Design a protein around this ligand. Structure first.
Ligand code: HEC
Ligand code: ZNH
Ligand code: ZNH
Lengths: 108, 294, 294
């Protein structure tokens, strides 16, 4: 695709340090500060049960595929303005492709 | 007759554009060296550094403060209350080699302003003019606050820095950044989830979490929550004290008010002890990396 | 044979406030029933409905248009080109029972104006006075355009609606809203990502995306992009004709010019066939829900 594919082992270290404090990747998992990321690939933005999302994340309604997710993780408040996702941003392409490779295998 | 007058003197020949270049260098390295401290990055240690070099100030005799840049000297460097900060110094030294003209105090304080702005925080007006002083003027160890204390201590300590209730509660909100490290202070864990993005999370966590007083691995007592967050006894004292509690609530409910108050209080913290002349330029508001298209 | 005069007659004793109340009811139901069509809402179907009832007009004999509100009857209700519009009617009928004094034509056209404004589009002046006409004034099927067509067809079709090149390119911009559904028209997919908000995205996508002619599951051909967007052959014809192309380029660059031209052309579309007495009140510009606090 337009995005490559990296190491799922690095993306595991990138998730446990930059995403786990808010997210969880297993089935029927907890909704901490952020939603359960299981099955997020092939689903629309703001469709996971039992969580209160912001009106900006719902009204954007984009199918989460590996390409538009890379645009999200680089700057969250730019692609979807008004979202409560307090994240700085993955500025490196290598850090993005490694994380998506892990998220493709952990959330499916 | 009077205390120490620390008069600001702009570095030989420098203006806004020169300092924007130092900000840009610090901001870029903050983006580049993102692997530090389990990917939290150097942002939090830079604001802690800016605070610790400023926090040595004593309003009664005008000793300490950011002016002299005395952190570069042994005594203040090896202060155990400064453990962890050597990483902030190591970050800033190649930037000092790139810009040898900037004083130590200006660089240390600019590092903090840069870190807050780059972590999506409020714009913090900054003034230049701090001048390096000899080894004499190096403040004695023990001027920084102890974390194992109460509200009365916090209030009385901050009086030495000319900070009122609103200013201390505002300043403490920087604890939304980074974490406590057992090896450094004897305390362990983050105050929040958004470790490297400046928000009002500190106040939200103080109020919305169920806190329990437990002993850590260094045998120190801290307040821990089920979400994996922590609060130092001095942080938790902000909700034990009724006057501090109302301000904590105000900031938890209004991030804009927190930003405005923090900006003023942080600028004051970094400027404490410095007398700025009237021919001296107006405070600089630096453009972020994002505003420059990066 | 000789042309039909359709004189606007204001609903007895009704003024601005009465119609603002109908606008508010539509607007609130639009916010409430946000579940519909994968969270796109009923907004797009309401503007499609306002266009479909108005697009039946024939200038040569003054038959059809928004005046009579004749969509409610069986013949125009079951027109294939009207597939999917039943949802728009289902949406508007409880609002009609809530305000039984409003004519069908007035409600249908107001639904369109309301939808555009509530989705952050331009203010569209709207005039009341459409009067309900019987079952035989009901226009014959096949008066709406075919999507499969080229620029020459689009131009000639819109001539029947007294629309010039600027008016048709402006009107087609409503395709920034919603999507094509295979079960309805035999075409599938959205024209843009911002489906529930009125923008100039239709023109930006038409010019900036890499389009490829492809067959769909209903065996019709449409233009598709790698980003998942589509264009009907009639839409793509706007970049094949040189006159329409210049106007597409103009709107892609200037959203404010598109907003101004769309408001004029949409109002004209909704008013086609109606003779307004100098009597008659000035057009109403309704306040949005946001403008009323709510
Ligand atoms: C905590 C402070 C966060 C960190 C660090 C990360 N995310 Fe998160 N995320 C968080 C919240 C509060 C929300 C909800 C936003 C809203 O507007 O309601 C999210 C959301 C997402 C989503 C979208 C889910 C959906 O729409 O169904 C995704 C795909 C997501 N976050 C991914 C993600 C990744 C991979 C991260 C690691 C680097 C990450 N987030 C960190 C809060 C926080
Ligand atoms: C009372 C008072 C007080 C006290 C006691 C304190 C204390 C503290 C401690 C203990 C710690 C830890 C260290 C380690 O590493 O381990 C910290 C950190 C800290 N800190 Zn803080 N503080 C304070 C204030 C403060 C202020 C005022 C500020 C600013 C503004 C700050 C900022 C900080 C930061 C940011 C940090 C981070 C670091 C890192 O992470 O690295 N701070 N601190
Ligand atoms: C040429 C011409 C033309 C044509 C052919 C058309 C066609 C069409 C089609 C095919 C469709 C689809 C349907 C389904 O569902 O599937 C549509 C839709 C449509 N549409 Zn459009 N159109 C047109 C014009 C138009 C106009 C003029 C307007 C207005 C103004 C419109 C608006 C519309 C809308 C909005 C829509 C969407 C809807 C939904 O989504 O629901 N439109 N459309």
């Amino acid at each position: 695709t337009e995005f490559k594919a990296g190491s799922a082992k690095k993306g595991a270290t990138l998730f446990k340090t930059r995403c786990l404090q808010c997210h969880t990747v297993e089935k029927g998992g907890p909704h901490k500060v952020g939603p359960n990321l299981h099955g997020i690939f092939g689903r629309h933005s703001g469709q996971a049960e039992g969580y209160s999302y912001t009106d900006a994340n719902i009204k954007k309604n984009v199918l989460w595929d590996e390409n538009n997710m890379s645009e999200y993780l680089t700057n969250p408040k730019k692609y979807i303005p008004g979202t409560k996702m307090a994240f700085g941003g993955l500025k490196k392409e290598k850090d993005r492709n490694d994380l998506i490779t892990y998220l493709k295998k952990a959330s499916e | 007759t009077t205390p120490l007058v620390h008069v600001a003197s702009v570095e030989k020949g420098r203006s806004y554009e020169d300092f924007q270049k130092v900000y840009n260098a610090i901001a870029l390295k903050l983006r580049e060296d993102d692997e530090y401290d389990n990917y939290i990055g150097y942002g939090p240690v830079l604001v802690r550094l800016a605070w610790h070099i400023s926090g040595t100030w004593d309003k009664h005799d005008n000793t300490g403060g950011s002016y002299g840049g005395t952190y570069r000297f042994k005594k203040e460097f090896n202060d155990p209350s400064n453990a962890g900060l050597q990483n902030g110094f190591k970050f800033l030294e190649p930037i000092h080699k790139e810009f040898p003209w900037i004083s130590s105090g200006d660089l240390f304080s600019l590092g903090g302003v840069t870190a807050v702005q780059e972590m999506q925080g409020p714009k913090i007006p900054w003034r230049c003019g701090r001048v390096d002083t000899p080894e004499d003027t190096t403040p004695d160890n023990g001027r920084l606050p102890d974390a194992d204390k109460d509200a009365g201590y916090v209030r009385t300590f901050f009086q030495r820095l000319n900070m009122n209730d609103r200013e201390v509660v505002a300043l403490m909100g920087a604890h939304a950044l980074g974490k406590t490290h057992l090896k450094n202070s004897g305390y362990e864990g983050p105050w929040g989830a958004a470790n490297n993005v400046f928000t009002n999370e500190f106040y939200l966590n103080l109020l919305n979490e169920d806190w329990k007083l437990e002993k850590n691995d260094a045998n120190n007592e801290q307040w821990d929550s089920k979400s994996g967050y922590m609060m130092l006894p001095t942080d938790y004292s902000l909700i034990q004290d009724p006057k501090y509690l109302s301000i904590v609530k105000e900031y938890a409910n209004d991030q804009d008010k927190f930003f405005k108050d923090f900006s003023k209080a942080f600028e004051k913290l970094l400027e404490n002890g410095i007398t700025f002349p009237k021919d001296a330029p107006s405070p600089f508001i630096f453009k972020t990396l994002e505003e420059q298209g990066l």
